[model samples]
Target: ALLLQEAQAGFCRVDGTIDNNHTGFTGSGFANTNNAQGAAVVWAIDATSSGRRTLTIRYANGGTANRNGSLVINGGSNGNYTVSLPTTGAWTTWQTATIDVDLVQGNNIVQLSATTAEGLPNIDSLSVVGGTVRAGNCG
Candidate 1:
Protein backbone atom coordinates (compact mmCIF):
# COMPACT_ATOMS: atom_id res chain seq x y z
CA ALA A 1 0.00 0.00 0.00
CA LEU A 2 0.95 3.59 -0.47
CA LEU A 3 0.68 5.90 2.49
CA LEU A 4 0.81 9.65 2.08
CA GLN A 5 1.15 12.35 4.70
CA GLU A 6 0.81 16.02 3.88
CA ALA A 7 3.42 18.36 5.27
CA GLN A 8 0.81 20.64 6.78
CA ALA A 9 -1.11 17.82 8.35
CA GLY A 10 -1.79 18.19 12.05
CA PHE A 11 0.17 15.01 12.72
CA CYS A 12 3.34 16.43 11.26
CA ARG A 13 5.61 18.40 13.60
CA VAL A 14 7.21 21.19 11.64
CA ASP A 15 9.56 23.89 12.84
CA GLY A 16 8.00 26.11 10.23
CA THR A 17 4.74 27.51 9.07
CA ILE A 18 2.14 25.99 6.77
CA ASP A 19 1.79 28.10 3.68
CA ASN A 20 0.33 27.91 0.19
CA ASN A 21 2.16 30.89 -1.18
CA HIS A 22 3.72 28.57 -3.71
CA THR A 23 1.61 26.85 -6.28
CA GLY A 24 1.51 23.22 -7.44
CA PHE A 25 1.74 21.74 -3.94
CA THR A 26 -0.31 18.72 -3.06
CA GLY A 27 -3.06 18.80 -0.45
CA SER A 28 -3.97 22.05 1.28
CA GLY A 29 -0.49 23.50 1.63
CA PHE A 30 3.18 22.86 2.23
CA ALA A 31 5.66 23.38 5.03
CA ASN A 32 8.01 26.32 4.76
CA THR A 33 10.72 25.68 7.36
CA ASN A 34 12.66 28.40 9.07
CA ASN A 35 15.90 29.55 7.48
CA ALA A 36 18.12 28.06 10.15
CA GLN A 37 19.96 24.90 10.83
CA GLY A 38 18.06 22.23 12.81
CA ALA A 39 14.72 23.34 11.42
CA ALA A 40 12.78 20.22 10.55
CA VAL A 41 9.56 18.51 9.61
CA VAL A 42 8.79 15.22 11.31
CA TRP A 43 6.12 12.78 10.25
CA ALA A 44 4.70 9.91 12.24
CA ILE A 45 3.88 6.83 10.14
CA ASP A 46 2.67 3.31 10.80
CA ALA A 47 3.40 -0.01 9.18
CA THR A 48 1.44 -3.18 9.53
CA SER A 49 4.61 -5.22 9.19
CA SER A 50 8.33 -4.67 9.36
CA GLY A 51 10.42 -4.45 6.19
CA ARG A 52 12.11 -2.12 3.78
CA ARG A 53 10.01 0.60 2.21
CA THR A 54 10.50 3.28 -0.40
CA LEU A 55 10.10 6.70 1.15
CA THR A 56 9.49 9.65 -1.13
CA ILE A 57 9.42 13.29 -0.15
CA ARG A 58 7.85 15.85 -2.44
CA TYR A 59 9.46 19.28 -2.23
CA ALA A 60 10.36 22.48 -4.00
CA ASN A 61 13.59 24.47 -3.96
CA GLY A 62 13.71 27.69 -5.86
CA GLY A 63 17.29 28.48 -4.96
CA THR A 64 20.11 27.80 -7.37
CA ALA A 65 22.04 25.40 -5.16
CA ASN A 66 20.94 22.22 -3.52
CA ARG A 67 19.36 22.48 -0.11
CA ASN A 68 21.14 19.90 2.01
CA GLY A 69 19.63 18.18 5.01
CA SER A 70 19.63 14.97 7.03
CA LEU A 71 16.93 12.37 6.97
CA VAL A 72 16.52 10.70 10.35
CA ILE A 73 14.40 7.65 10.84
CA ASN A 74 13.08 6.32 14.11
CA GLY A 75 14.74 9.19 15.98
CA GLY A 76 18.11 8.53 14.30
CA SER A 77 18.39 4.90 15.35
CA ASN A 78 18.12 4.07 11.65
CA GLY A 79 20.94 6.43 10.78
CA ASN A 80 21.17 10.05 9.65
CA TYR A 81 21.13 9.98 5.87
CA THR A 82 22.06 13.00 3.83
CA VAL A 83 19.44 14.38 1.49
CA SER A 84 20.03 17.10 -1.06
CA LEU A 85 17.08 18.91 -2.51
CA PRO A 86 17.98 20.22 -5.91
CA THR A 87 16.30 23.22 -7.38
CA THR A 88 13.39 22.55 -9.67
CA GLY A 89 13.95 25.92 -11.31
CA ALA A 90 11.05 27.54 -9.54
CA TRP A 91 9.34 27.34 -6.18
CA THR A 92 6.14 26.32 -7.90
CA THR A 93 7.87 23.51 -9.71
CA TRP A 94 7.78 20.52 -7.37
CA GLN A 95 9.97 17.44 -7.38
CA THR A 96 10.48 14.28 -5.41
CA ALA A 97 13.40 12.85 -3.43
CA THR A 98 13.37 9.21 -2.48
CA ILE A 99 15.22 6.92 -0.08
CA ASP A 100 14.92 3.39 1.18
CA VAL A 101 14.04 2.90 4.84
CA ASP A 102 13.75 -0.06 7.16
CA LEU A 103 10.63 0.32 9.22
CA VAL A 104 9.55 -1.80 12.13
CA GLN A 105 6.04 -3.01 12.67
CA GLY A 106 3.85 -0.41 14.31
CA ASN A 107 4.80 3.26 14.43
CA ASN A 108 7.92 4.95 13.10
CA ILE A 109 9.08 8.53 12.99
CA VAL A 110 10.69 10.04 9.91
CA GLN A 111 12.31 13.43 10.09
CA LEU A 112 14.12 15.76 7.72
CA SER A 113 16.44 18.23 9.40
CA ALA A 114 18.22 21.13 7.81
CA THR A 115 22.00 21.11 8.00
CA THR A 116 22.65 24.55 6.53
CA ALA A 117 21.49 28.04 7.44
CA GLU A 118 19.27 28.03 4.38
CA GLY A 119 17.15 25.48 6.17
CA LEU A 120 15.04 22.96 4.25
CA PRO A 121 13.19 23.52 1.02
CA ASN A 122 9.45 23.80 1.05
CA ILE A 123 8.10 20.36 1.89
CA ASP A 124 4.96 19.23 0.14
CA SER A 125 4.32 15.75 1.41
CA LEU A 126 5.77 12.35 2.35
CA SER A 127 4.77 9.07 0.76
CA VAL A 128 5.79 5.53 1.63
CA VAL A 129 5.26 2.53 -0.62
CA GLY A 130 5.41 -0.97 0.78
CA GLY A 131 3.41 -3.48 2.71
CA THR A 132 0.20 -2.24 4.28
CA VAL A 133 1.08 1.07 5.86
CA ARG A 134 -0.52 4.27 7.07
CA ALA A 135 1.27 7.60 7.02
CA GLY A 136 0.16 10.15 9.58
CA ASN A 137 0.49 11.11 13.24
CA CYS A 138 -2.12 8.65 14.35
CA GLY A 139 -0.63 5.41 15.56
Candidate 2:
Protein backbone atom coordinates (compact mmCIF):
# COMPACT_ATOMS: atom_id res chain seq x y z
CA ALA A 1 0.00 0.00 0.00
CA LEU A 2 1.02 3.63 -0.46
CA LEU A 3 1.71 6.17 2.27
CA LEU A 4 -1.48 6.78 4.21
CA GLN A 5 -2.46 10.42 4.44
CA GLU A 6 -3.25 12.17 7.73
CA ALA A 7 -6.35 13.67 6.13
CA GLN A 8 -7.90 10.23 6.40
CA ALA A 9 -9.87 10.80 9.62
CA GLY A 10 -10.01 7.08 10.04
CA PHE A 11 -6.29 7.39 10.60
CA CYS A 12 -6.42 10.07 13.29
CA ARG A 13 -8.37 11.75 16.06
CA VAL A 14 -5.56 11.62 18.54
CA ASP A 15 -5.11 14.00 21.45
CA GLY A 16 -2.41 15.93 19.62
CA THR A 17 -2.06 18.98 17.43
CA ILE A 18 -2.51 18.86 13.66
CA ASP A 19 -0.31 21.33 11.87
CA ASN A 20 -0.39 22.08 8.14
CA ASN A 21 2.62 24.35 8.04
CA HIS A 22 4.99 21.52 7.28
CA THR A 23 6.46 21.35 3.76
CA GLY A 24 7.91 17.84 3.40
CA PHE A 25 4.86 15.95 4.60
CA THR A 26 3.16 13.62 2.16
CA GLY A 27 -0.30 15.04 2.72
CA SER A 28 1.21 18.44 3.39
CA GLY A 29 0.05 18.03 6.98
CA PHE A 30 0.92 16.17 10.17
CA ALA A 31 0.12 15.52 13.83
CA ASN A 32 2.42 17.37 16.17
CA THR A 33 3.60 15.55 19.25
CA ASN A 34 2.68 16.53 22.77
CA ASN A 35 4.74 15.18 25.64
CA ALA A 36 1.55 15.07 27.69
CA GLN A 37 0.94 11.67 29.16
CA GLY A 38 -1.40 9.43 27.16
CA ALA A 39 -1.08 11.63 24.08
CA ALA A 40 -1.57 9.44 21.02
CA VAL A 41 -2.43 9.15 17.34
CA VAL A 42 -4.34 6.16 16.11
CA TRP A 43 -4.74 4.77 12.62
CA ALA A 44 -7.54 2.44 11.57
CA ILE A 45 -6.56 -0.24 9.12
CA ASP A 46 -8.54 -2.94 7.39
CA ALA A 47 -6.18 -5.79 6.95
CA THR A 48 -6.67 -7.97 3.89
CA SER A 49 -4.89 -10.78 5.65
CA SER A 50 -4.11 -12.08 9.14
CA GLY A 51 -0.41 -11.93 9.81
CA ARG A 52 2.57 -9.64 10.12
CA ARG A 53 2.26 -6.17 8.71
CA THR A 54 5.12 -3.77 8.18
CA LEU A 55 4.76 -0.08 8.98
CA THR A 56 6.88 2.98 8.38
CA ILE A 57 6.03 6.12 10.30
CA ARG A 58 7.19 9.43 8.99
CA TYR A 59 8.06 11.85 11.78
CA ALA A 60 10.43 14.55 12.97
CA ASN A 61 12.34 14.65 16.21
CA GLY A 62 13.09 18.26 17.00
CA GLY A 63 14.63 17.80 20.43
CA THR A 64 18.33 17.61 21.09
CA ALA A 65 17.85 14.26 22.85
CA ASN A 66 16.20 11.11 21.58
CA ARG A 67 12.51 10.55 22.12
CA ASN A 68 10.56 7.33 22.61
CA GLY A 69 7.05 5.94 22.41
CA SER A 70 4.98 2.80 22.12
CA LEU A 71 2.99 0.93 19.49
CA VAL A 72 -0.36 -0.39 20.47
CA ILE A 73 -2.06 -3.13 18.48
CA ASN A 74 -5.77 -3.35 19.06
CA GLY A 75 -5.36 -1.63 22.42
CA GLY A 76 -2.66 -4.11 23.40
CA SER A 77 0.69 -2.66 24.36
CA ASN A 78 3.94 -4.24 23.20
CA GLY A 79 7.05 -2.80 24.79
CA ASN A 80 9.24 -4.63 22.31
CA TYR A 81 7.52 -2.67 19.61
CA THR A 82 8.68 0.68 20.89
CA VAL A 83 9.91 3.51 18.68
CA SER A 84 13.05 5.58 19.19
CA LEU A 85 13.23 8.84 17.29
CA PRO A 86 16.45 10.70 16.71
CA THR A 87 16.74 14.40 16.01
CA THR A 88 16.33 15.09 12.30
CA GLY A 89 18.32 18.35 12.55
CA ALA A 90 15.05 20.22 12.58
CA TRP A 91 11.36 19.45 13.01
CA THR A 92 10.81 20.54 9.41
CA THR A 93 13.26 17.90 8.30
CA TRP A 94 11.37 14.60 7.97
CA GLN A 95 12.48 11.06 8.68
CA THR A 96 10.96 7.60 8.94
CA ALA A 97 10.97 4.66 11.34
CA THR A 98 9.98 1.13 10.35
CA ILE A 99 8.47 -1.66 12.45
CA ASP A 100 6.56 -4.89 12.13
CA VAL A 101 3.17 -5.42 13.73
CA ASP A 102 1.08 -8.54 13.81
CA LEU A 103 -2.55 -7.93 12.98
CA VAL A 104 -5.62 -10.01 12.70
CA GLN A 105 -7.77 -10.18 9.60
CA GLY A 106 -10.50 -7.59 9.27
CA ASN A 107 -10.42 -4.46 11.41
CA ASN A 108 -7.07 -3.67 12.98
CA ILE A 109 -6.22 -0.69 15.15
CA VAL A 110 -2.71 0.62 15.41
CA GLN A 111 -1.82 3.45 17.75
CA LEU A 112 1.36 5.47 18.09
CA SER A 113 1.49 7.18 21.39
CA ALA A 114 3.52 8.57 24.27
CA THR A 115 2.82 6.23 27.14
CA THR A 116 6.15 6.79 28.81
CA ALA A 117 7.87 9.77 30.36
CA GLU A 118 10.09 10.13 27.31
CA GLY A 119 7.06 11.29 25.34
CA LEU A 120 6.66 10.97 21.58
CA PRO A 121 8.17 12.45 18.47
CA ASN A 122 6.19 14.55 16.03
CA ILE A 123 4.41 12.09 13.77
CA ASP A 124 3.59 13.00 10.20
CA SER A 125 1.97 9.84 8.80
CA LEU A 126 2.16 6.07 8.60
CA SER A 127 2.18 3.69 5.62
CA VAL A 128 2.15 -0.01 5.07
CA VAL A 129 5.82 0.54 4.30
CA GLY A 130 6.42 -3.06 3.20
CA GLY A 131 4.25 -6.11 3.45
CA THR A 132 2.13 -8.23 1.15
CA VAL A 133 -1.60 -8.43 1.60
CA ARG A 134 -3.02 -11.74 0.55
CA ALA A 135 -5.46 -10.63 -2.07
CA GLY A 136 -8.49 -12.49 -3.26
CA ASN A 137 -7.86 -15.67 -5.19
CA CYS A 138 -9.04 -15.95 -8.75
CA GLY A 139 -10.34 -19.27 -9.82
Candidate 3:
Protein backbone atom coordinates (compact mmCIF):
# COMPACT_ATOMS: atom_id res chain seq x y z
CA ALA A 1 0.00 0.00 0.00
CA LEU A 2 0.99 3.61 -0.32
CA LEU A 3 1.27 6.11 2.53
CA LEU A 4 1.32 9.85 2.13
CA GLN A 5 2.82 12.10 4.78
CA GLU A 6 2.43 15.81 4.46
CA ALA A 7 5.58 17.82 5.06
CA GLN A 8 3.89 20.13 7.51
CA ALA A 9 2.21 17.35 9.45
CA GLY A 10 2.75 17.08 13.17
CA PHE A 11 4.62 13.80 12.80
CA CYS A 12 7.30 15.59 10.87
CA ARG A 13 10.16 17.61 12.35
CA VAL A 14 11.08 20.66 10.36
CA ASP A 15 14.13 22.82 10.92
CA GLY A 16 12.24 25.69 9.42
CA THR A 17 8.72 26.84 8.96
CA ILE A 18 5.53 25.72 7.23
CA ASP A 19 4.17 28.05 4.60
CA ASN A 20 1.26 28.01 2.17
CA ASN A 21 2.51 30.90 0.11
CA HIS A 22 3.18 28.60 -2.77
CA THR A 23 0.47 26.93 -4.77
CA GLY A 24 0.15 23.31 -5.91
CA PHE A 25 0.99 21.80 -2.54
CA THR A 26 -0.74 18.64 -1.39
CA GLY A 27 -1.41 19.37 2.26
CA SER A 28 -2.22 22.50 4.23
CA GLY A 29 1.28 23.76 3.62
CA PHE A 30 4.80 22.86 2.55
CA ALA A 31 7.99 22.93 4.61
CA ASN A 32 10.36 25.71 3.77
CA THR A 33 13.73 24.88 5.26
CA ASN A 34 16.00 27.58 6.57
CA ASN A 35 18.32 28.98 3.95
CA ALA A 36 21.37 27.40 5.49
CA GLN A 37 23.28 24.18 5.43
CA GLY A 38 22.04 21.37 7.70
CA ALA A 39 18.45 22.57 7.65
CA ALA A 40 16.22 19.52 7.36
CA VAL A 41 12.80 17.94 7.46
CA VAL A 42 12.40 14.53 9.07
CA TRP A 43 9.43 12.27 8.61
CA ALA A 44 8.51 9.40 10.88
CA ILE A 45 6.86 6.49 9.11
CA ASP A 46 5.39 3.16 10.18
CA ALA A 47 5.77 0.03 8.13
CA THR A 48 3.62 -3.04 8.64
CA SER A 49 6.31 -5.16 6.99
CA SER A 50 10.01 -4.69 6.47
CA GLY A 51 11.42 -4.55 2.94
CA ARG A 52 12.56 -2.30 0.15
CA ARG A 53 10.25 0.57 -0.76
CA THR A 54 10.11 3.55 -3.02
CA LEU A 55 10.09 7.03 -1.40
CA THR A 56 8.69 9.83 -3.49
CA ILE A 57 9.20 13.39 -2.35
CA ARG A 58 7.06 16.15 -3.81
CA TYR A 59 8.68 19.57 -3.92
CA ALA A 60 9.24 22.77 -5.87
CA ASN A 61 12.48 24.58 -6.53
CA GLY A 62 12.16 28.00 -8.06
CA GLY A 63 15.78 28.94 -7.62
CA THR A 64 18.14 29.14 -10.52
CA ALA A 65 20.41 26.37 -9.30
CA ASN A 66 19.77 22.90 -7.98
CA ARG A 67 19.22 22.50 -4.27
CA ASN A 68 21.31 19.56 -3.09
CA GLY A 69 20.79 17.58 0.07
CA SER A 70 21.32 14.29 1.87
CA LEU A 71 18.64 11.67 2.48
CA VAL A 72 19.39 9.60 5.54
CA ILE A 73 17.25 6.70 6.64
CA ASN A 74 17.38 5.37 10.18
CA GLY A 75 20.31 7.52 11.25
CA GLY A 76 22.25 6.84 8.07
CA SER A 77 22.72 3.11 8.61
CA ASN A 78 20.75 2.45 5.45
CA GLY A 79 23.09 4.87 3.62
CA ASN A 80 23.38 8.64 3.42
CA TYR A 81 21.87 9.30 0.04
CA THR A 82 22.27 12.45 -2.00
CA VAL A 83 19.45 14.32 -3.74
CA SER A 84 19.72 17.02 -6.37
CA LEU A 85 16.60 19.09 -6.70
CA PRO A 86 16.60 21.05 -9.88
CA THR A 87 14.49 24.07 -10.69
CA THR A 88 10.82 23.26 -11.24
CA GLY A 89 10.27 26.44 -13.29
CA ALA A 90 8.28 28.20 -10.58
CA TRP A 91 7.52 27.83 -6.91
CA THR A 92 3.95 27.10 -7.88
CA THR A 93 5.10 24.28 -10.11
CA TRP A 94 5.55 21.06 -8.18
CA GLN A 95 7.49 17.93 -9.02
CA THR A 96 8.25 14.55 -7.53
CA ALA A 97 11.57 12.83 -6.97
CA THR A 98 11.90 9.13 -6.20
CA ILE A 99 14.46 6.97 -4.43
CA ASP A 100 14.58 3.37 -3.26
CA VAL A 101 15.05 2.67 0.44
CA ASP A 102 15.04 -0.19 2.90
CA LEU A 103 12.62 0.14 5.77
CA VAL A 104 12.27 -1.93 8.90
CA GLN A 105 9.02 -3.03 10.43
CA GLY A 106 7.48 -0.55 12.84
CA ASN A 107 8.87 2.97 12.89
CA ASN A 108 11.53 4.55 10.74
CA ILE A 109 13.05 8.01 10.48
CA VAL A 110 13.61 9.43 7.02
CA GLN A 111 15.39 12.77 6.90
CA LEU A 112 16.39 15.14 4.15
CA SER A 113 19.09 17.67 5.06
CA ALA A 114 20.33 20.57 3.05
CA THR A 115 23.98 20.46 2.01
CA THR A 116 24.38 24.03 0.87
CA ALA A 117 23.54 27.48 2.14
CA GLU A 118 20.61 27.67 -0.26
CA GLY A 119 19.00 24.91 1.72
CA LEU A 120 16.30 22.61 0.33
CA PRO A 121 13.37 23.28 -1.91
CA ASN A 122 9.83 23.70 -0.67
CA ILE A 123 8.78 20.18 0.28
CA ASP A 124 5.12 19.35 -0.20
CA SER A 125 4.89 15.77 1.00
CA LEU A 126 6.37 12.29 1.04
CA SER A 127 4.73 9.20 -0.39
CA VAL A 128 5.91 5.78 0.70
CA VAL A 129 4.98 3.13 -1.84
CA GLY A 130 5.30 -0.62 -1.34
CA GLY A 131 5.38 -3.13 1.52
CA THR A 132 2.46 -1.99 3.61
CA VAL A 133 3.46 1.27 5.17
CA ARG A 134 1.50 4.07 6.77
CA ALA A 135 2.08 7.58 7.92
CA GLY A 136 3.35 7.69 11.46
CA ASN A 137 1.18 9.16 14.16
CA CYS A 138 2.14 11.95 16.50
CA GLY A 139 2.53 11.07 20.14
Candidate 4:
Protein backbone atom coordinates (compact mmCIF):
# COMPACT_ATOMS: atom_id res chain seq x y z
CA ALA A 1 0.00 0.00 0.00
CA LEU A 2 0.88 3.69 0.02
CA LEU A 3 1.99 3.45 3.69
CA LEU A 4 4.23 0.48 3.12
CA GLN A 5 7.37 2.54 3.47
CA GLU A 6 6.59 3.99 6.93
CA ALA A 7 7.21 7.72 7.41
CA GLN A 8 9.28 9.54 10.06
CA ALA A 9 8.53 12.38 12.55
CA GLY A 10 9.82 13.75 15.90
CA PHE A 11 9.98 16.51 18.50
CA CYS A 12 9.13 19.86 16.89
CA ARG A 13 9.78 17.74 13.86
CA VAL A 14 6.64 18.85 12.06
CA ASP A 15 6.25 22.36 10.76
CA GLY A 16 2.61 23.41 10.96
CA THR A 17 -0.29 21.77 9.21
CA ILE A 18 -3.01 22.08 11.82
CA ASP A 19 -5.29 19.11 11.83
CA ASN A 20 -5.90 20.83 15.18
CA ASN A 21 -7.34 17.63 16.47
CA HIS A 22 -4.98 14.66 15.92
CA THR A 23 -2.44 14.70 13.17
CA GLY A 24 1.15 13.82 12.26
CA PHE A 25 1.70 10.60 14.21
CA THR A 26 4.48 8.32 12.99
CA GLY A 27 2.55 5.71 15.02
CA SER A 28 0.58 6.20 18.24
CA GLY A 29 -2.40 5.77 20.58
CA PHE A 30 -1.68 8.18 23.48
CA ALA A 31 -4.29 8.73 26.21
CA ASN A 32 -5.35 12.03 27.71
CA THR A 33 -8.20 14.28 28.94
CA ASN A 34 -9.67 17.84 29.03
CA ASN A 35 -9.86 18.53 25.30
CA ALA A 36 -6.37 17.14 25.02
CA GLN A 37 -4.99 16.70 21.53
CA GLY A 38 -1.69 15.06 20.50
CA ALA A 39 -0.03 11.97 19.09
CA ALA A 40 1.57 8.63 20.14
CA VAL A 41 3.22 5.62 18.52
CA VAL A 42 4.24 2.00 19.20
CA TRP A 43 7.41 0.87 17.49
CA ALA A 44 8.01 -2.87 17.25
CA ILE A 45 11.60 -3.96 17.38
CA ASP A 46 13.95 -6.71 18.45
CA ALA A 47 16.56 -6.78 21.28
CA THR A 48 18.96 -4.89 19.06
CA SER A 49 17.16 -1.56 18.89
CA SER A 50 14.86 -2.34 21.78
CA GLY A 51 17.84 -2.55 24.10
CA ARG A 52 18.21 1.16 23.57
CA ARG A 53 15.66 3.76 22.47
CA THR A 54 14.67 7.24 23.51
CA LEU A 55 11.24 8.86 23.84
CA THR A 56 10.79 12.49 22.93
CA ILE A 57 7.31 13.96 23.41
CA ARG A 58 6.81 17.51 22.12
CA TYR A 59 3.64 19.04 23.50
CA ALA A 60 2.07 22.12 25.11
CA ASN A 61 -0.99 23.69 26.73
CA GLY A 62 -2.68 27.09 26.93
CA GLY A 63 -5.40 26.74 29.47
CA THR A 64 -6.13 26.18 33.20
CA ALA A 65 -6.52 22.44 33.10
CA ASN A 66 -3.18 21.60 34.71
CA ARG A 67 -2.00 18.44 33.01
CA ASN A 68 -0.03 15.58 34.57
CA GLY A 69 0.82 12.20 33.10
CA SER A 70 3.51 9.97 31.62
CA LEU A 71 4.62 8.24 28.40
CA VAL A 72 4.91 4.47 28.83
CA ILE A 73 7.35 3.29 26.17
CA ASN A 74 6.98 -0.45 26.56
CA GLY A 75 9.92 -2.80 26.11
CA GLY A 76 7.95 -5.89 25.18
CA SER A 77 9.36 -8.77 27.24
CA ASN A 78 12.48 -6.97 28.29
CA GLY A 79 10.28 -5.93 31.23
CA ASN A 80 11.46 -2.35 30.84
CA TYR A 81 9.38 0.81 31.20
CA THR A 82 9.59 4.59 31.41
CA VAL A 83 6.77 5.72 33.65
CA SER A 84 5.24 8.17 36.19
CA LEU A 85 6.25 11.60 34.94
CA PRO A 86 4.50 14.91 35.56
CA THR A 87 3.32 16.67 32.41
CA THR A 88 3.01 20.26 33.58
CA GLY A 89 3.84 23.32 31.56
CA ALA A 90 5.86 20.84 29.58
CA TRP A 91 5.23 22.12 26.10
CA THR A 92 4.68 25.14 23.90
CA THR A 93 4.69 26.86 27.29
CA TRP A 94 7.52 25.29 29.32
CA GLN A 95 10.01 22.40 29.40
CA THR A 96 10.28 19.00 27.73
CA ALA A 97 11.81 15.60 28.46
CA THR A 98 13.93 13.24 26.42
CA ILE A 99 13.45 9.86 28.12
CA ASP A 100 16.25 7.46 27.31
CA VAL A 101 14.83 3.94 27.02
CA ASP A 102 15.96 0.30 26.94
CA LEU A 103 13.36 -2.28 26.16
CA VAL A 104 13.22 -5.95 24.99
CA GLN A 105 12.45 -7.55 21.67
CA GLY A 106 9.35 -8.91 19.83
CA ASN A 107 6.25 -6.68 20.20
CA ASN A 108 6.18 -3.82 22.69
CA ILE A 109 3.55 -1.37 24.00
CA VAL A 110 3.63 2.36 24.66
CA GLN A 111 0.86 4.41 26.29
CA LEU A 112 0.66 8.00 27.48
CA SER A 113 -1.72 7.91 30.39
CA ALA A 114 -2.59 10.97 32.46
CA THR A 115 -1.98 11.11 36.19
CA THR A 116 -5.01 13.21 37.09
CA ALA A 117 -8.18 11.55 35.91
CA GLU A 118 -9.58 14.80 34.48
CA GLY A 119 -6.48 16.96 34.57
CA LEU A 120 -5.37 18.66 31.38
CA PRO A 121 -3.33 16.53 29.02
CA ASN A 122 -0.30 18.18 27.42
CA ILE A 123 0.95 16.38 24.36
CA ASP A 124 1.92 17.11 20.77
CA SER A 125 4.31 14.42 19.70
CA LEU A 126 5.67 10.95 20.52
CA SER A 127 7.62 8.06 18.95
CA VAL A 128 9.94 4.99 19.23
CA VAL A 129 9.81 3.99 15.60
CA GLY A 130 13.48 4.16 14.95
CA GLY A 131 15.91 1.35 14.00
CA THR A 132 15.87 -1.45 11.44
CA VAL A 133 15.02 -5.12 11.84
CA ARG A 134 17.53 -7.94 11.64
CA ALA A 135 17.77 -10.35 8.73
CA GLY A 136 16.89 -14.02 8.84
CA ASN A 137 17.17 -16.96 6.47
CA CYS A 138 15.39 -16.07 3.23
CA GLY A 139 15.62 -19.55 1.75
RMSD of each: 2.1, 5.2, 2.1, 8.7
lDDT by residue (61-116, candidate 2, tens digit) is 77787676778766773223687777788878999988887867766567777755
List candidate 3 segments past 4 Å from native. Answer: 1-3, 7-10, 137-139
Candidate 3, TM-score vs. the true structure?
0.89
Model 1, backbone clash pairs (residues 3+ apart or across chains), number: 0
Query: Of models 1 and 2, which has the larger lDDT?
Result: 1
Name model 4 segments beyond 4 Å from true: 1-48, 63-66, 73-95, 129-139
The lDDT of model 1 is: 0.81
Model 4 worst lDDT run, 10 consecutive residues: 1-10
lDDT score at residue 120, model 3, on the 0-100 scale: 96
Q: Per-residue lDDT for 17-100 in model 4, tens only?
A: 223344432334222344433233332333344466665555554445544444453423344444433445423343344666
Candidate 1 lDDT, tens digit per residue, 9-37? 32467798888998998788888899999
Backbone clashes, each candidate: 0, 0, 0, 3
lDDT of 4 at 85: 37
Query: Model 4's lDDT to the true fold?
Result: 0.39
Ranking of all predicted structures according to lDDT, beginning with the best and ending with the worst: 3, 1, 2, 4
Worst-scoring 10-residue span by lDDT in model 3: 1-10
User: Candidate 3's residue-wise lDDT over 1-139, tens digit each?
Assistant: 4545454332477789988997898767888999999999888778888898888889999999899879997778766788878889999999988888888887788889998899999998888788777776443
C-alpha lDDT (0 to 100) for residue 101 of candidate 2: 78
